Amino acid sequence: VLFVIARFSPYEWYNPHPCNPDSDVVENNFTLLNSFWFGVGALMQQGSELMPKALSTRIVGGIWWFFTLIIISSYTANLAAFLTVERMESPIDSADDLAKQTKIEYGAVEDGATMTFFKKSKISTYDKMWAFMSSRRQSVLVKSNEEGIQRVLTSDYAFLMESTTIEFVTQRNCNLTQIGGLIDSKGYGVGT
């Protein structure tokens, strides 16, 4: 629309002709290639050799400058926020992701409730985990919680355990967190 006006405005047709203007000279510097160069040149805050004459093209240059004043000013405002790195999302996020992979070994404390949970489970996702855990039972089923915590640190291993004991570990080691929501709900009760 700058090129349409500059080929319609009867004042943009100026003569370069510096000495003494005779006749038969005048020509627009706004070719259609040039009008992108004013549009890109004003948008990139650097300014062009082009500068309009002829008030109808000044208003296009006036409103496009106030357009690109706000867009550059708004872009620099949020740019302090978005220059923060995000750490990698874990390849597991729930029981469905952790069951459908063989890269990360996973088990629980043997002779515990979690081993007993998947052993007598009939959920199709959770039966896949006990189908996994029963095969390499010597390797992935550790003997205690402390051996389960240590093999997460010293290897590539996701460990199935209680929620409240995670609440003590993750407040102690800040490199190691809870993945996903609670599978079931249980309770510590004083046995009699």
């Binding site: 706000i70 000013s73 708004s74 709900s185």
Partner: protein, 48 residues
């Protein structure tokens, strides 16, 4: 009682405060509406 079938907790129920949107003339907000006139009366003044 039997042994529970659902876990509870006392909590507070209250209305959400309305998130009034920054309407599409939001970029005029960082200056007062008389300062936008005072800049406009400057560039109409200093140019004169």
């Amino acid at each position: 009682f039997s042994k529970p079938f659902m876990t509870l907790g006392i909590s507070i129920l209250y209305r959400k405060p309305n998130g009034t949107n920054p309407g599409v003339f939001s970029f005029l907000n960082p200056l007062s509406p008389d300062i936008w006139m005072y800049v406009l009366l400057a560039c109409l003044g200093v140019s004169c």
